[PDB]
Amino acid sequence: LRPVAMVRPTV
Amino acid sequence: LRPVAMVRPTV
Amino acid sequence: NSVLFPCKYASSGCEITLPHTEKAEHEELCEFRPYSCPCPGASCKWQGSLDAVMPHLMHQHKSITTLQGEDIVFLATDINLPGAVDWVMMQSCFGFHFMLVLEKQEKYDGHQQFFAIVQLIGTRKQAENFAYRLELNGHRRRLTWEATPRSIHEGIATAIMNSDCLVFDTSIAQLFAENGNLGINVTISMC
Amino acid sequence: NSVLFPCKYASSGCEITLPHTEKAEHEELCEFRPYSCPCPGASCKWQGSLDAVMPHLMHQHKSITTLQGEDIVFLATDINLPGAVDWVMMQSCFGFHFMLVLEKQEKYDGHQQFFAIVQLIGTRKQAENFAYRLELNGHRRRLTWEATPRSIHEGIATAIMNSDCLVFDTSIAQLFAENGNLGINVTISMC
Ligand SMILES: [Zn+2]
Ligand SMILES: [Zn+2]
Ligand SMILES: [Zn+2]
Ligand SMILES: [Zn+2]
Predict the structure, then answer these.
(1) What architecture is the C1-57 domain classified under in CATH?
(2) Could you tell me how many helices (H) and strands (E) chain B has, helices first?
(3) What is the maximum span of chain B, computed from C-alpha positions, in angstroms?
(4) B9 and C69 in contact by Cβ < 8 A?
(5) Residue B1 at interface with chain C, using a CB cutoff of 8 Å
(6) For chain C, which residues make up each domain, given as ranges?
(7) Which residue does chain D place closest to A11, by CA atoms?
């Protein structure tokens, strides 16, 4: 089972 | 290695 | 205590009446459902029963190349022709005939895209028992698309509009291309 | 013609010495050229030895995620945001750190597209030993792009220019996103 990165955007 | 189908363009 | 309603096509002599909960299920397989001509381009205006579709193709359309195999190469020849273009060929296997379509489309000026997709001469229940995989290869890069075969009914202009297919710009093409030829691997498998 | 110019960057190492019309054809492919901040922002104007790069991002952009493991899931949050968006993240594995970037932009006025690609924070001899795979799942549909990663030297701008990387359009990212969120599985591997 893979790790998960919740990445935040940027305009 | 697979069979090859040499296909021609139409319009 | 249900209410039942005549199949859509009954106006083509279907004699079946079914509760709405079930009218799709049959309306799909209803052997009275009439099909258009799967061959890309409004050229042909034939129409007939599912079963008349594969003979029709191998009668009036002999330009269409065919292949027996579960894995082939669909080799879209002379990729750089300017404008709209269309390759089309056919792939028989598993007692079925699937139809592969590469298609170049310049739909937004200056941005020319390729759009490749597969479709089964069959019904949507039928399609579902199957998966296709198109794949492009170049130097140390590969791009693969999986999906389940579209259905001759549903057609493919929407699939193509939604980009529910494989799709890649020309610049890309070039990195996957061979003396002006684009080799697409294709495997159809069962499920 | 034995007029042998030193390289500019020999003021900080380089010992190569070459004919006039080969200079700028080496001075961008040097191993001694200074680096520019590999963060995909236009803003940051940092420079320094490769080894001071990872230190750079860690101090100046603490804003930026990191994860370990040769097989993670880059989850781009809230994809539908209108405009030139971008996601950046870092993936340490194999003694090395890799920069995973996903860049939404309107490439031809009237068609906005996604652009996910990976780079190794290392020298290009170094990148040539890896391969990466991004892959996007959705209901019985899957699209995969694989290739070896760039050196952050080379930078990625060129690649996305020519489209050498993974490129799909908002239309499709729809059947891939889950609740406004695109998951891209990244596996990095060796060779
Ligand atoms: Zn019926
Ligand atoms: Zn016809
Ligand atoms: Zn030099
Ligand atoms: Zn910086």
Answers:
(1) 2-Layer Sandwich (3.30)
(2) 0, 1
(3) 31
(4) no
(5) no
(6) 1-57, 58-191
(7) D85
